[PDB]
Design a protein around this ligand. Structure first.
Ligand SMILES: *[C@@H]1O[C@H](CO)[C@@H](O[C@@H]2O[C@H](CO)[C@@H](O[C@@H]3O[C@H](CO[C@H]4O[C@H](CO)[C@@H](O)[C@H](O)[C@@H]4O)[C@@H](O)[C@H](O[C@H]4O[C@H](CO)[C@@H](O)[C@H](O)[C@@H]4O)[C@@H]3O)[C@H](O)[C@H]2NC(C)=O)[C@H](O)[C@H]1NC(C)=O
Ligand SMILES: *[C@@H]1O[C@H](CO)[C@@H](O[C@@H]2O[C@H](CO)[C@@H](O[C@@H]3O[C@H](CO[C@H]4O[C@H](CO)[C@@H](O)[C@H](O)[C@@H]4O)[C@@H](O)[C@H](O[C@H]4O[C@H](CO)[C@@H](O)[C@H](O)[C@@H]4O)[C@@H]3O)[C@H](O)[C@H]2NC(C)=O)[C@H](O)[C@H]1NC(C)=O
Ligand SMILES: *[C@@H]1O[C@H](CO)[C@@H](O[C@@H]2O[C@H](CO)[C@@H](O[C@@H]3O[C@H](CO)[C@@H](O)[C@H](O[C@H]4O[C@H](CO)[C@@H](O)[C@H](O)[C@@H]4O)[C@@H]3O)[C@H](O)[C@H]2NC(C)=O)[C@H](O)[C@H]1NC(C)=O
Ligand SMILES: *[C@@H]1O[C@H](CO)[C@@H](O[C@@H]2O[C@H](CO)[C@@H](O[C@@H]3O[C@H](CO)[C@@H](O)[C@H](O[C@H]4O[C@H](CO)[C@@H](O)[C@H](O)[C@@H]4O)[C@@H]3O)[C@H](O)[C@H]2NC(C)=O)[C@H](O)[C@H]1NC(C)=O
Ligand SMILES: *[C@@H]1O[C@H](CO)[C@@H](O[C@@H]2O[C@H](CO)[C@@H](O[C@@H]3O[C@H](CO)[C@@H](O)[C@H](O)[C@@H]3O)[C@H](O)[C@H]2NC(C)=O)[C@H](O)[C@H]1NC(C)=O
Ligand SMILES: *[C@@H]1O[C@H](CO)[C@@H](O[C@@H]2O[C@H](CO)[C@@H](O[C@@H]3O[C@H](CO)[C@@H](O)[C@H](O)[C@@H]3O)[C@H](O)[C@H]2NC(C)=O)[C@H](O)[C@H]1NC(C)=O
Ligand SMILES: *[C@@H]1O[C@H](CO)[C@@H](O[C@@H]2O[C@H](CO)[C@@H](O)[C@H](O)[C@H]2NC(C)=O)[C@H](O)[C@H]1NC(C)=O
Ligand SMILES: *[C@@H]1O[C@H](CO)[C@@H](O[C@@H]2O[C@H](CO)[C@@H](O)[C@H](O)[C@H]2NC(C)=O)[C@H](O)[C@H]1NC(C)=O
Ligand SMILES: *[C@@H]1O[C@H](CO)[C@@H](O)[C@H](O)[C@H]1NC(C)=O
Ligand SMILES: *[C@@H]1O[C@H](CO)[C@@H](O)[C@H](O)[C@H]1NC(C)=O
Ligand SMILES: *[C@@H]1O[C@H](CO)[C@@H](O)[C@H](O)[C@H]1NC(C)=O
Ligand SMILES: *[C@@H]1O[C@H](CO)[C@@H](O)[C@H](O)[C@H]1NC(C)=O
Ligand SMILES: *[C@@H]1O[C@H](CO)[C@@H](O)[C@H](O)[C@H]1NC(C)=O
Ligand SMILES: *[C@@H]1O[C@H](CO)[C@@H](O)[C@H](O)[C@H]1NC(C)=O
Lengths: 332, 332
């Protein structure tokens, strides 16, 4: 037996959050209409256990108008996304700003996402309804991405928004640069969630996990910055960690380390290719090492460890540290 | 092999947070000066790996003048405390109040404590220094317990307190009944921590985990409620869960379920006696089942699971679910 650098599952209940490298609906918008762009084995399209869009991550769909309603449910959860918001995209809001605080926003968003998806099993995006108020206010623009989450409104009063139906949410709380402090005060219970931005040049965010109540917003600022899209975590289950595959570009383009900083123990197992990224369909689709990683979905396993995935459960060479499931031993 | 209902350790680096049932200095204040009151095996006094006081829990030492500076360091952490703040003590602040919100405060405190001690290894109590301001204000009293954490002061301005030296703190943020909102705004970074109390009759608390910065307090209230004691978590290590033994009274006295509600997976393993509590030294010291539980400290083991502790690592009967360490298998 040997630990394997794959992502897998223990039973028939798993789910994958994919992208254009795992999109079975991406063939309807290509020129060469084959299956040579998928990083997964192409017999996995008929499951319904894969949510994937033509060039959408969960962060990009969460903040921006380039939207795909991800929806999934499963015990073991595997992610393959994050290639659609990188230092390659150079996203800012005003030319004196920067994108490193956007990479910190990506780290905080995926940290909150793995930390909540290790405990819940259902995931979808929900909207935040309001009245017909002052609709938007264009404070950020970059000609390649335009965000709607969060809304910017001239303050003048305390707005309200309710949350029901779900079990645990994930809204943003974003500010540019101030001495002020926006709050998401709960009317029913009384729990207060706040954030300020002192020294971060561009639009800094944190990602709180709200409960299904009714919330008001108060900031004492010229612009309250209030969300319009939020996640939805349902059907709280027993603790199952969330697996990652390192979704990055080719080395001629930019990359980051955000999916490894956000993926920490015990709630998360990070799988990375050892070699570089050499595509098959084009430069940026179909690497053989990532086919070797994603090929573990095709079969049940016994154990899931921090160092690898174990197929059989008789014995093994190295000890499974931070193991999960029916796991073999290394004693003679 | 068989899973055991004990608490144990994997190497020479462990620590126990005890009480008067595990206090080797409690013999200097007794009448019958023997070792028949310890729930542990009495050859463990010379380690320095046990912190324990004559009738102090960590919650009681954290809020009240009945104080013991707990100090410990270790990889595997075992608790045996919580018998010193129960529904047997009937603690309130004003006769129209209640102690069930104090049991909710105990649940939230121990949840924050296990969640942080699963990742750090050093634990001690620190003080919060101030100027010579208005010293106290007696808002709560119960003739058996008098708390100093938090201080109550007529507001009149925004106070400041700094935190340095440590790596991660744990301060309270407590209020009685208001429509107002106290905050612990960070001057340096800008992170805001707040809480309000709408419908909870007695002094409700939440326990935030501050970073070592400099914090100001603003509430817009007649009384800001500001801490004077805080925990200190140092030397961040790799994830090791924190073990609990169910520290309760005898059944003729009151009990609770707080140490089982606060101890949830994956960060915590809860060990409980199956039978009742029949003491040996008196009614409330030295049960044979808790001697059987605490006797696992005397020897190294291989695995630590949610269902039991495994000594050898050849094979076992049932599968170790949520295991930890060098763990055996159950495949034939
Ligand atoms: C998953 O695993 C892969 C490995 O397969 C990791 O890829 C490595 O990523 C790091 C950074 O992300 C790379 O380090 C950088 O190397 C540059 C030079 O690389 C040349 O040499 C290598 C062989 O050594 C060639 O393969 C490669 O094609 C290049 O020809 C340096 O110039 C970089 O330094 C610059 O950036 C840093 C960033 O902080 C600055 O501090 C420096 O001052 C400088 O400006 C950098 O050191 C590494 O080369 C990659 N390896 C390979 C084999 O490609 C992934 O990072 C990993 N995934 C995660 C999430 O960690
Ligand atoms: C660790 O494991 C021990 C078991 O060894 C648990 O102890 C049990 O604790 C629960 C509650 O904490 C007890 O349930 C209560 O039982 C009362 C009657 O008990 C009699 O009968 C048992 C045998 O069945 C005798 O052993 C016992 O001495 C008594 O003679 C009920 O009257 C209680 O109901 C009342 O309180 C509840 C509280 O919500 C109300 O809702 C009810 O309406 C009612 O007012 C209650 O059901 C149980 O008896 C204990 N077992 C034993 C063997 O003593 C520990 O709780 C566990 N530790 C943790 C943290 O869970
Ligand atoms: C992203 O996708 C998710 C899931 O795909 C989605 O959440 C779902 O939204 C739908 C509607 O958008 C919800 O469906 C409603 O559920 C309630 C409660 O069960 C029903 O009463 C509703 O029925 C009424 O409306 C029907 C027509 O829609 C009528 O036929 C009927 O007679 C009723 O009048 C309705 O079915 C659903 O509850 C949620 N949640 C789940 C878990 O499915 C989410 O809204 C999407 N978000 C975005 C931004 O696209
Ligand atoms: C609970 O207990 C903990 C640990 O027992 C305790 O934390 C420690 O407090 C002491 C002092 O109370 C700290 O010791 C100081 O550390 C600094 C930095 O190393 C030294 O520079 C200091 O030395 C000065 O003072 C000495 C006399 O105390 C002089 O001899 C010397 O020349 C210097 O002038 C001093 O040793 C210590 O750093 C902390 N932390 C740790 C990890 O030990 C905590 O204060 C206690 N809390 C309560 C409420 O009792
Ligand atoms: C991994 O383990 C799971 C364990 O559930 C396997 O799922 C189960 O696979 C068997 C294969 O024979 C399914 O039985 C078949 O069911 C269909 C109807 O669903 C029936 O028409 C067939 O004749 C056969 O009886 C079983 O239903 C299925 N369990 C489910 C879906 O809950 C899974 O196949 C294993 N392998 C992989 C690669 O996932
Ligand atoms: C559980 O495992 C740990 C693994 O570290 C054991 O600790 C080690 O025990 C040996 C026992 O021989 C110690 O060796 C002795 O060291 C002393 C000096 O410390 C020396 O005087 C003796 O002659 C002997 O060589 C070893 O130091 C110790 N490791 C430490 C302290 O880091 C432990 O004994 C095992 N058992 C239990 C019940 O904990
Ligand atoms: C290890 O577990 C496998 C599970 O089937 C046992 O069966 C062996 O499986 C391998 C690969 O699937 C085959 O190459 C062997 O021929 C199988 N052996 C037999 C006897 O059928 C295997 O016996 C187990 N090894 C042990 C318990 O030592
Ligand atoms: C299981 O592990 C033990 C670890 O020592 C092996 O040794 C046995 O230990 C038990 C209890 O300590 C003794 O009763 C046996 O006599 C020991 N056996 C031998 C051969 O010394 C034991 O061999 C292992 N069992 C396996 C691998 O099946
Ligand atoms: C912002 O960018 C503009 C672009 O020319 C520059 O003139 C200006 O100095 C920068 N800084 C501020 C504070 O406006
Ligand atoms: C705006 O929404 C609030 C939500 O509580 C509601 O009370 C109010 O009537 C709405 N106003 C309009 C004009 O729809
Ligand atoms: C915010 O505070 C800083 C320092 O206190 C000050 O320099 C700056 O002018 C303030 N900005 C506003 C809009 O008050
Ligand atoms: C509080 O307790 C006192 C004790 O007698 C009682 O008179 C009073 O009605 C109670 N309630 C309030 C709101 O003061
Ligand atoms: C009170 O403490 C603050 C801390 O910043 C300090 O600035 C101030 O001088 C102190 N006042 C007195 C009277 O000690
Ligand atoms: C707090 O709010 C409630 C309901 O809004 C009200 O009944 C109560 O009088 C308020 N208390 C104070 C001190 O304003």
């Amino acid at each position: 037996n040997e630990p394997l650098n794959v992502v897998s599952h223990l039973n028939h209940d798993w789910f994958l959050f994919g992208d254009s490298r795992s999109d079975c609906n991406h063939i309807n918008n290509l020129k060469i209409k084959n299956f040579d762009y998928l990083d997964i084995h192409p017999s996995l399209c008929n499951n319904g256990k894969i949510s994937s869009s033509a060039g959408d991550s969960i962060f990009k769909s969460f903040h921006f108008t380039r939207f795909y309603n991800y929806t999934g449910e499963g015990d073991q959860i595997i992610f393959y996304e994050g290639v659609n918001f990188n230092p390659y995209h150079r996203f800012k809001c005003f030319p004196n700003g920067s994108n490193d605080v956007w990479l910190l926003n990506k780290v905080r968003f995926y940290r909150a996402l793995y930390s909540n998806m290790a405990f819940f099993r259902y995931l979808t995006f929900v909207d935040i309804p309001y009245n017909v108020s002052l609709s938007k206010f264009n404070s950020c623009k970059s000609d390649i991405l335009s965000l709607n989450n969060p809304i910017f409104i001239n303050y003048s009063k305390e707005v309200y928004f309710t949350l029901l139906g779900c079990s645990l949410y994930l809204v943003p709380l974003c500010l540019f640069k101030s001495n002020f402090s926006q709050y998401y005060y709960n009317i029913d219970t009384g729990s207060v969630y706040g954030f300020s931005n002192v020294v971060y040049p561009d639009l800094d965010c944190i990602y709180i996990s709200l409960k299904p109540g009714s919330y008001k917003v108060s900031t004492t600022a010229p612009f309250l910055s209030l969300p319009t899209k939020a996640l939805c975590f349902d059907k709280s289950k027993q603790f199952v960690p969330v697996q990652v595959v390192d979704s990055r570009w080719n080395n001629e383009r930019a990359s980051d380390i955000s999916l490894s900083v956000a993926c920490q123990l015990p709630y998360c197992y990070f799988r990375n290719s050892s070699a570089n990224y050499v595509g098959k369909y084009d430069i940026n689709h179909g690497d053989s090492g990532f086919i070797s990683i994603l090929s573990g979905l095709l079969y049940n396993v016994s154990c899931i460890s921090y160092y690898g995935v174990f197929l059989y459960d008789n014995f093994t060479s190295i000890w499974p540290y931070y193991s999960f499931g029916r796991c073999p031993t290394s004693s003679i």
